Amino acid sequence: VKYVDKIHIGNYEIDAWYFSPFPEDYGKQPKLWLCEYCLKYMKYEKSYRFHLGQCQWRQPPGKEIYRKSNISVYEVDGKDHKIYCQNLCLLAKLFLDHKTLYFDVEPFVFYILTEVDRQGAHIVGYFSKEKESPDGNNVACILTLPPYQRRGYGKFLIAFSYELSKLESTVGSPEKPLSDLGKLSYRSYWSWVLLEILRDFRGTLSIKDLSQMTSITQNDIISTLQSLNMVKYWKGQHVICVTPKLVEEHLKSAQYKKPPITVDSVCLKWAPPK
Ligand SMILES: [Zn+2]
Numbered sequence: 001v002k003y004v005d006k007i008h009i010g011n012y013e014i015d016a017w018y019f020s021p022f023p024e025d026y027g028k029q030p031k032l033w034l035c036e037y038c039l040k041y042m043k044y045e046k047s048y049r050f051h052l053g054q055c056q057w058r059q060p061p062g063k064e065i066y067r068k069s070n071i072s073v074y075e076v077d078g079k080d081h082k083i084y085c086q087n088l089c090l091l092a093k094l095f096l097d098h099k100t101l102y103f104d105v106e107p108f109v110f111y112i113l114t115e116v117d118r119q120g121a122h123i124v125g126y127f128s129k130e131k132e133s134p135d136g137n138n139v140a141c142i143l144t145l146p147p148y149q150r151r152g153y154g155k156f157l158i159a160f161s162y163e164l165s166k167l168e169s170t171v172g173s174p175e176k177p178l179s180d181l182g183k184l185s186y187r188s189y190w191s192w193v194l195l196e197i198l199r200d201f202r203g204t205l206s207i208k209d210l211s212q213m214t215s216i217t218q219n220d221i222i223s224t225l226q227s228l229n230m231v232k233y234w235k236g237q238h239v240i241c242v243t244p245k246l247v248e249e250h251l252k253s254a255q256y257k258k259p260p261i262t263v264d265s266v267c268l269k270w271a272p273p274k
Pocket residue numbers: 035036037038039040051055056057
């Protein structure tokens with residue numbers, strides 16, 4: 001009946017937050033050991049140490065579609081790399097309460113954020129995405145591993161998901177519910193993207209324009225603008241406020257400034273599937 005409650009991955013030891021359905025025999029041990037590259041989960045330090053000496057993987061499988069300095073993102077199709085993506089989903093489930101899919105990964109593509117050094121590309125976080133979403137979900141599950149959280153990596157993944165959406169010529173929204181950190185990070189990302197635009201744009205633009213510029217839904221733009229006191233309802237119309245001074249102030253607060261890392265669309269090499 002004992003669940004996996006602690007993992008070792010790369011050089012990190014991390015306590016679990018939630019039940020993840022690793023095979024029962026894996027929960028029995030004190031710790032679960034994961035190869036930081038192929039995500040294979042193991043029962044013993046000895047088998048982990050042996051595996052590390054043998055495993056040839058130094059990065060996620062699939063295609064490296066983004067690269068800038070020591071940051072890379074890999075796109076991994078669930079159909080082409082089933083085992084990896086299963087390993088990934090079981091890992092993620094330790095830290096996500098509401099993720100319900102671990103084994104049927106074929107309908108998903110996964111985007112793995114990594115930081116890269118001489119050794120290899122080290123996993124920081126990911127988001128999964130349904131290959132077919134009539135509901136307009138541009139993210140299914142999103143997560144940064146605990147030691148990396150609240151450092152700009154979550155908002156990077158969020159940004160990346162909208163850059164894909166932009167290239168798809170469509171608005172997107174993450175599947176609900178989000179973690180508390182998820183909600184907070186989306187709000188801060190939207191705020192930053194919008195303030196940046198409202199700072200620059202000289203002409204007039206509506207919420208409709210903003211949505212098409214960012215792939216953020218009108219609903220999310222509106223709630224974001226409302227919390228920033230940058231919109232009013234007048235004669236049955238949402239009207240954006242100008243006030244360029246407030247914009248500058250907002251862009252300086254910790255809550256809404258440019259994150260420490262950002263997505264350079266020039267470094268994104270990706271075309272939507274036809
Ligand atoms: Zn391995």
